[PDB]
Design a protein around this nucleic acid. Structure first.
Ligand code: NA
Ligand code: NA
Lengths: 240, 249
DNA sequence: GCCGGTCGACCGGC
DNA sequence: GCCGGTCGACCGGC
C-alpha cells in the first residue's frame, strides 16, 4: 500500500476534526500528489495521453492488463464515445473512490464514513461475484501483484451541528482470510463488513488468496442454494 | 384504490413539475405525490411513519411493544407496517417515528379500515429501460401466507405510481405517469430477481392488469410461483456461480 | 430485444 | 453475539 506508510499521518489530521472523505483526498493529493487520481480522472488522463488511438478496442488495450481492464474500464459505448469534448465524470460504479498508481502498480482505495452511534449494520462493499471474476482473471493471466483493494474508514458522531471524527481504520482486502468474508447473497451477492472488523490474518501469496477465495465463493454458493430451499420453499409448500 | 378515482387529475398536476437536480435522482418527486394526495384526500393520506405515530398518539395508555402491536388489529398489516420491537417500545410523543429506508410503503391511504399501500416508482426516461425493484418477493410470499392463515383477503391493496422524468437544465421534470395495482396482475408472470434483493421487478407502465380470480386465489397462485422460482434459482446458482469457477480449485 | 447483476446504506429477530 | 433481508432505481453485453 502507498497509503499505509502515511496512515498515522492521516489518522492524525482526522481524529478530532469537525464538519470527511474530501479531507482524505485532499491530504492524499498534497502528500502523494504524483500518485493520487479519482478513478474517472485516471481514465480521462489515460485516454488524453494517447489521442492517437481511438475506438474502444484500441483504448481497451491501453490498460495493458485483462484484470485491470475488467476492474476499471467504463464499457464499450462510453469508451467509444470518449473524446476531449466528452470526458468521463464521477460515477459511483467506479470500483475505486481513489486510485493510487506508481510504476504500474495500483492501489484501489475505498474511503468510508461511519456514524459510530448508529449500531453496527455492515454495508455492501463489493459484489462477491465480481470479485470471483476478478480472481479468475488474475489466475488466468497470472497477474498476482498488479493491484491491491484497500479501505479507509472514518468513524464520527454528532456533536451539535458538527460531526466529529473519533477514530479511523485501514484494512487491505487481500490480507483478509478469504473464508472470513461474509457474502450476503440476498443483498446483491455483496460482501459486507465494517472496515474495523475485517480480518487481516492471511499469510499466503496473492495466488493462494485468489484460489482460497474461489473455494470460499463456490462453497457459499452451494450453501445458499440449500438455504433457499429451507427458507423459501419448505415453509410455503403447505399452501400449494 | 382511493387514488384511482382522481388519477387523471394527479397525472395532470404532476406532469410539468420540477425538482432541483442533485439515492436515485428522482426520488424527490415522491414528495410531490404526497403533497397532492394530502391536499385532495386529506383525511385518507399518511406517510407510513405518520400513520404509526397517529395510531400510537391516539392510544397513550397503550404502553409496551406487545400492547402497541395489538393496535394494528391485523397480523398481516402488523407484518407490513410495524417497526421493530425496541423501536415500538421506545416510541413516545417526544420520540416519534421518522421516515425509514426499508418501510414497505411510501404513502398509505386508509378509509373505513381498508388500506392502500402506495409505492411511488420514479423513472429516468432518458436512459434505457431497466425494471426497478418493486417489492421483495419474500416479503410478498410471507404476506400471502399471512393473508391465507388469517383469512385477510379484503383488507389492503398494494399499488404503484410511476413518475417518469428527464433532466432539463438545472432541474428534473416530470413528463408522464402510470398507475397499476399489484393484485390485478398475473402472479405467475411476476419476474423475481433473486440477486437484486430478491425483488419482484417490472415497469408500472407495462404491468398486466387482467387477473380474473379472487384475492385468495391470487395469494395461492403467487406462493406456487414463488416456490417454483426459488427451487429453480437454487439449481441455476450451481450452473452460474459454481460450475464456472470449479476449475480454479 | 432479452436478461439479470450492482452500488449505497440500512435494523432487528432470537 | 450471530446472522441476513429491504428499500432505491439503475445498464451494458451480444
Ligand atoms: Na418508492
Ligand atoms: Na418497494
Amino acid at each position: 500500500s502507498f497509503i499505509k506508510p502515511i496512515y498515522q499521518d492521516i489518522n492524525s489530521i482526522l481524529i478530532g476534526q469537525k464538519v470527511f472523505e474530501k479531507l482524505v483526498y485532499k491530504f492524499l493529493k498534497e502528500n502523494l500528489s504524483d500518485l493520487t487520481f479519482k478513478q474517472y480522472e485516471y481514465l480521462n488522463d489515460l485516454f488524453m495521453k494517447n489521442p492517437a488511438i481511438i475506438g474502444h478496442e484500441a483504448r481497451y488495450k491501453l490498460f495493458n492488463s485483462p484484470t485491470l481492464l475488467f476492474l476499471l474500464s467504463r464499457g464499450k459505448a462510453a469508451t467509444e464515445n470518449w473524446s476531449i469534448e466528452n470526458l468521463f465524470e464521477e460515477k459511483q460504479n467506479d470500483t475505486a473512490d481513489i486510485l493510487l498508481v506508481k510504476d504500474q502498480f495500483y492501489e484501489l482505495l475505498d474511503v468510508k464514513t461511519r456514524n459510530i452511534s448508529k449500531s453496527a449494520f455492515a454495508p455492501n462493499i463489493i459484489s462477491a461475484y465480481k470479485l470471483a471474476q476478478t480472481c479468475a482473471k488474475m489466475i488466468d493471466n497470472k497477474e498476482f501483484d498488479l493491484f491491491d483493494i484497500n479501505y479507509l474508514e472514518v468513524d464520527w458522531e454528532l456533536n451539535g451541528e458538527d460531526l466529529v471524527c473519533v477514530s479511523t481504520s485501514f484494512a487491505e482486502l487481500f490480507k483478509s482470510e478469504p473464508s472470513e468474508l461474509y457474502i450476503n447473497w440476498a443483498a446483491a451477492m455483496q460482501i459486507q463488513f465494517h472496515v474495523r472488523d475485517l480480518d487481516q490474518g492471511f499469510n499466503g501469496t496473492r495466488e493462494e488468496w485468489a484460489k482460497s477465495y474461489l473455494k470460499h465463493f463456490v462453497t457459499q454458493a452451494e450453501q445458499r442454494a440449500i438455504s433457499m430451499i429451507d427458507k423459501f420453499v419448505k415453509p410455503f409448500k403447505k399452501y400449494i
